[PDB]
Amino acid sequence: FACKTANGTAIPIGGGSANVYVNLAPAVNVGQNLVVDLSTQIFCHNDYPETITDYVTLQRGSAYGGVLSSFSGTVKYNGSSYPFPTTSETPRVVYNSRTDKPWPVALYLTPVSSAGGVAIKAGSLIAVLILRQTNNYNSDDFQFVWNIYANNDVVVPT
Ligand SMILES: [Ca+2]
């Protein structure tokens, strides 16, 4: 089992970490949603699907930078909603193919009233999402750590 981002970089068998650079709406009003869809960015596959079933969860999701200070939100994992930052592990998603399949994570972040001017700086760390992978075959229990960085500034008008 292994994963990769749309702009190249990979995390190998056994887990590890990688940076993901995401384009964000340049402006979002208080009470409107900023959507960070990682299904277009993070892909995973099963290396031996004839024999093994891989199980994948969102173990933990946390906010950093401007998202931590100026936004509240939820995370959608495989169509279901959870508070973000997370306090519980999600149900699993099954990976049973060599073909790259999206990791179905999306963040829904709404600016709080207090926000104004530049809320998210370009290049800043905005989230860490931990993908946890197990299987039906042995004791493998791996973390794939995705560090999410903003490609551009996000302005929240006062
Ligand atoms: Ca592949």
TrEMBL record:
<dbReference type="GO" id="GO:0009289">
    <property type="term" value="C:pilus"/>
</dbReference>
<keyword id="KW-0106">Calcium</keyword>
<comment type="similarity">
    <text>Belongs to the fimbrial protein family.</text>
</comment>
<keyword id="KW-0479">Metal-binding</keyword>
<dbReference type="GO" id="GO:0043709">
    <property type="term" value="P:cell adhesion involved in single-species biofilm formation"/>
</dbReference>
<protein>
    <submittedName>
        <fullName>FimH protein</fullName>
    </submittedName>
</protein>
<feature type="binding site">
    <location>
        <position position="100"/>
    </location>
    <ligand>
        <name>Ca(2+)</name>
    </ligand>
</feature>
<keyword id="KW-0281">Fimbrium</keyword>
<feature type="binding site">
    <location>
        <position position="98"/>
    </location>
    <ligand>
        <name>Ca(2+)</name>
    </ligand>
</feature>
<feature type="disulfide bond">
    <location>
        <begin position="3"/>
        <end position="44"/>
    </location>
</feature>
<feature type="domain" description="FimH mannose-binding">
    <location>
        <begin position="3"/>
        <end position="147"/>
    </location>
</feature>
<dbReference type="GO" id="GO:0046872">
    <property type="term" value="F:metal ion binding"/>
</dbReference>
